[PDB]
């Protein structure tokens, strides 16, 4: 029992994205909807390989968001690029404005940050009401909850290209240099290894931000 052909705008036979156990998302077809226990499960047949039974927060539409339909806190799937492109879940941290050059800032579930274009993200079909509650990494879950609830109050540090600061990474504070500023992100060069990371200018991983937040009266 509880078989359905539709759930609002979700219709058996539609194109869809589904989350695999690798945490990457893949295109397929919604082949069934069923009410099981407290809610619905969605059966996806992937284009490449496999079938999965998924919760509604683990499927996304196969279309890009119209201009102006996402908000800070929206649960999305976005393109992640290493050389290779993958689709990974995240949270919208900033919506398009000229100063971010009309891009979306995404905080991915593993803590990675990037700006993406409108054609690089897909809306998750049935997010949790508090959208961060399905983020597995408790430190990213907690950060996102604080960030979304405080928005638009976003203390940031003003950094300039060529400035030298310490940046935290994996428990060590490293000598680093500001290479580039891009909206709410800064490209930090770690001097020891000469590798770069884009970091949010409100992150306490940046020593001037850590210093400001730790001070008190």
């Amino acid at each position: 029992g509880g078989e359905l052909s539709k759930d609002g705008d979700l219709i058996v036979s539609m194109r869809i994205l589904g989350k695999k156990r690798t945490k990457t998302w893949h295109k397929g077809t919604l082949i069934a909807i069923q009410t099981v226990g407290p809610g619905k499960k969605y059966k996806v047949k992937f284009d490449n390989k496999g079938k999965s039974l998924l919760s509604g927060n683990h499927i996304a539409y196969d279309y890009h968001p119209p201009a102006d339909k996402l908000y800070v806190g929206s649960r999305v799937v976005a393109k992640y690029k290493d050389g290779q492109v993958w689709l990974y879940a995240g949270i919208v941290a900033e919506t398009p404005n000229v100063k971010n050059k009309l891009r979306f800032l995404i905080f991915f579930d593993d803590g990675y940050a990037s700006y993406v274009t409108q054609s690089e993200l897909y809306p998750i079909c049935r997010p949790l009401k508090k959208t961060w509650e399905d983020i597995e990494d408790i430190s990213c879950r907690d950060f996102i909850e604080e960030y979304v609830t405080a928005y638009p109050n976003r203390p940031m540090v003003l950094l300039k290209s060529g400035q030298l600061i310490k940046t935290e990474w994996e428990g060590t504070w490293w000598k680093s240099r500001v290479e580039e500023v891009d909206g709410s992100l800064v490209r930090i060069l770690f001097l020891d290894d000469k590798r770069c990371e884009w970091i949010y200018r409100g992150s306490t991983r940046l020593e001037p931000m850590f210093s400001m937040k730790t001070s008190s009266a």
Binding site: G111, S139, C140, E168, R195
Partner: peptide
């Protein structure tokens, strides 16, 4: 020349 992510906050 990307470093693997350090996340949004310092490691606990």
């Amino acid at each position: 020349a990307r470093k693997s992510t350090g996340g949004k906050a310092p490691r606990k």
